[PDB]
A paper describes a structure:
Here we detected a novel GH13 family α-glucosidase, QsGH13, from the deep-sea bacterium Qipengyuania seohaensis sp. SW-135. The α-glucosidases (EC:3.2.1.20) are members of GHs and are widely distributed in all organisms that are specific mainly for the exohydrolysis of α-1,4-glycosidic linkages at the non-reducing end of polysaccharides, such as maltooligosaccharides, and release α-D-glucose. The GH13 family belongs to the GHs members and is mainly composed of (β/α)8-barrel fold catalytic domain A, a loop-rich domain B, and a conserved domain C. The enzymes of the GH13 family catalyze reactions mainly through a double-displacement mechanism, in which catalytic nucleophilic (Asp) and acid/base catalyst (Glu) play an essential role. QsGH13 is highly substrate specific and only hydrolyzes sugars containing alpha-1,4 glucoside bonds.
The crystal structures of QsGH13 molecules were fully built to 2.2-Å resolution with the satisfied Rwork and Rfree values of 21.83 and 27.38%, respectively. According to the diffraction dataset, the QsGH13 crystal belongs to the monoclinic space group P212121, with unit-cell parameters a = 58.815 Å, b = 129.920 Å, c = 161.304 Å, α = γ = β = 90°, which contains two monomers per asymmetric unit. QsGH13 has typical and conserved characteristics of the GH13 family, where the catalytic domain A (residues 1–107, 176–463) is composed of a typical TIM barrel, sandwiched between the loop-rich domain B and the conserved domain C, and it is mainly composed of (β/α) eight-barrel structures, including eight α-helical and eight β-fold. The loop-rich domain B (residues 108–175) is derived from the domain A, including an α-helix and three β-fold, which are involved in the formation of QsGH13 dimers and forms catalytic pockets with domain A. Domain C (residues 464–525) is composed of multiple highly conserved β-folds that stabilizes the entire protein structure. The QsGH13 monomers formed dimers mainly through five hydrogen bonds and 105 non-bonded contacts. After the superposition of two monomers, the root-mean-square deviation (r.m.s.d.) value was 0.250 Å using the DALI server. QsGH13 forms a deep and narrow catalytic pocket of 14 residues in (β/α) eight-barrel structures (TIM) away from the dimeric interface. Although it is not clear how many amino acids are involved in the catalytic process of QsGH13, we found that eight residues in the catalytic pocket, including Tyr65, His105, Arg200, Glu266, Asp202, Phe292, His328, and Asp329, are conserved in the family of GH13. The β → α loop 4 of QsGH13 is located above the catalytic pocket, and it is associated with substrate specificity. The β → α loop 4 of QsGH13 is demonstrated to be more dynamic than other regions of QsGH13 and the β → α loop 4 of HaG and XgtA by IUPred2A analysis.
Author numbering: 5 to 497, 499 to 525
Write the structure that this text describes.
Amino acid sequence: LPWWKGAVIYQIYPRSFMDSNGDGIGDLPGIAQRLPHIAELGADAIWISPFFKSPMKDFGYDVSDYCDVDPIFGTLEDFDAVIARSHELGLKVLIDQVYSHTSDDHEWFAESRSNRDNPKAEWYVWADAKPDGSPPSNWQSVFGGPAWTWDARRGQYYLHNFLSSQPQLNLHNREAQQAVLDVMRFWLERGVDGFRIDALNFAMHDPQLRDNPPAPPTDKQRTRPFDFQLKTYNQSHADIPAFIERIRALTDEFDGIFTVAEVGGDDAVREMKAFTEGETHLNSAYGFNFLYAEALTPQLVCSALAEWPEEPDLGWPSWAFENHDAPRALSRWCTPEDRQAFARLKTLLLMSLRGNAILYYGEELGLTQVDIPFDQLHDPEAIANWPLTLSRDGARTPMPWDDSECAGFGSTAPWLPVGDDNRPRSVAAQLGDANSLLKFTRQAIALRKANPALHHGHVVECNHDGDLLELVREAGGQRLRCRFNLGSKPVECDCEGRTLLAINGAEPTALPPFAAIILE
């Protein structure tokens, strides 16, 4: 019965939650003021995306000091206040930990790149050019172009799976391993309740520097060099789990800690279970099954869930429909016509999946993707790979609190725009509206919490037939039948039970368009 098993986690993007000093950017005092929103929602924890000292090339995921707060967001004083307010509200607090790379402006890299003999020479991945000047391997950056960059300081290439500004850490190096573990300890000694571990399968590359093989044609249009090749050797080294053991060993030194890993790629499930196996690795992990899905299908849900059987040493999966890395799901999965009814099907479904619900800021209000022009881009990835981008900027818009000029974000000049379609969806307006998605999400969260078959139950059946999904889950004497219509065709279901919840005119025997019902 660990607190995290069955939790809902509300992910905060601190640049766009609440700007408490009027510069156009969210900040930690902003988050402190707004925390009651999350509490009243009934989320068990917050996960704060990176707020550490950073040049902000990957907007905080390029860390230059692992143990301080960036001036953009306030101070270490302000982080201790978010922890204390959260705990007073009964919220657990998770922070992002970014261990596959640092900024190029990090003190470790400034030492590493200085020459070939320094104590940190080997904390990053250095290799000579080919005799013709070429890079040491054919590896390609996640964000466009190659995964290696020249440094004349050393007369060598250095590896970066992401921007040239995010040189890959060499976690094969036990001194680097020890250093990032000591960073995690710093954060654990400040009362943090655990971690979201960034791109954990990028922690470790192949020391042999073998070329990646060509990718088969899964004819998703190829957007960038990275899409041409299987990520065989640039990442996913067999030794990552041994490193994760030292993490769990470290978190076991403190009370009631939760770890969840982000795990990228289509090679996904094998490293997720390896990263979460038994009680020696991480608690949980999430992948991109929903983040990169064009459509929400029953077959995609029964595919995803089938990967995580209740076997005795298997991990506990986490689910993310949307976050800062993928367009707002309502802009992917449904027409404007269908949006209102779909938003509640989707929210109820997230709460009915076996695993943890990763709710992203704005998801409880039904915020839509804001289209960001090429002139107005921030994400380097998009400028490089236009028009075939990851569309992350439009996912990162300021949280709308009221219907004021600044929508209560704290700035008539925010760093990204609110979006005309998100302005009417503000938390204030939704607190006045009795059928609001804010009020529905509360209800979905309360129904998961109070029902042990939703909260944690086994998936005893997952049945898919065209647009109909049925989840049969079960725990503590309870057996629930969860029926979902992911389609605009009224579908006819043989129940013989009690309706816990019915939406969009769902009945025990019939499901109109985008209707769902939980039967006990």
